[PDB]
């Protein structure tokens, strides 16, 4: 029974091609204007010149779940950004490689 399920893919990005950007992804958060609640953080543009792009090969409009093991699935967009900024850098250069858990919604409208 698999139709409209969402899968979590984990990309591990070493801080090698880092400096060009951190990972080289652009993310943004959106809010449901109807639900008056955040939809979470989604990828908007991949920077083709960053380790996450090179190694991970992630996509646009994917939904960011967790970063370096720390999850943002549950906290608001502005909260999430703080968690990201802090963990992507502070724990990123700490681990040496940064772990990104992103979610893929099985739907045809996906890029």
């Amino acid at each position: 029974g698999s139709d409209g399920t969402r899968e979590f893919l984990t990309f591990e990005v070493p801080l090698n091609d880092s400096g060009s950007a951190g990972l080289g992804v652009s993310v943004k958060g959106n809010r449901s204007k109807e639900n008056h609640a955040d939809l979470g953080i989604f990828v908007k543009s991949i920077i083709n010149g960053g380790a996450a792009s090179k190694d991970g090969r992630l996509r646009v409009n994917d939904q960011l779940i967790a970063v370096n093991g720390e999850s943002l699935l549950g906290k608001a967009n502005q909260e999430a950004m703080e968690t990201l900024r802090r963990s992507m850098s502070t724990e990123g250069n700490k681990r040496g490689m940064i772990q990104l858990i992103v979610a893929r919604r099985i739907s045809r409208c996906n890029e």
């Binding site: 950007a21 652009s26 943004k28 958060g29 908007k44 996450a52």
Partner: peptide, 16 residues
């Protein structure tokens, strides 16, 4: 060229 989406949002983007 104007009026894209609908809402007072500057699109909160974060680049990693």
């Amino acid at each position: 060229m104007l009026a894209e989406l609908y809402g007072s949002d500057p699109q909160e983007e974060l680049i990693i």
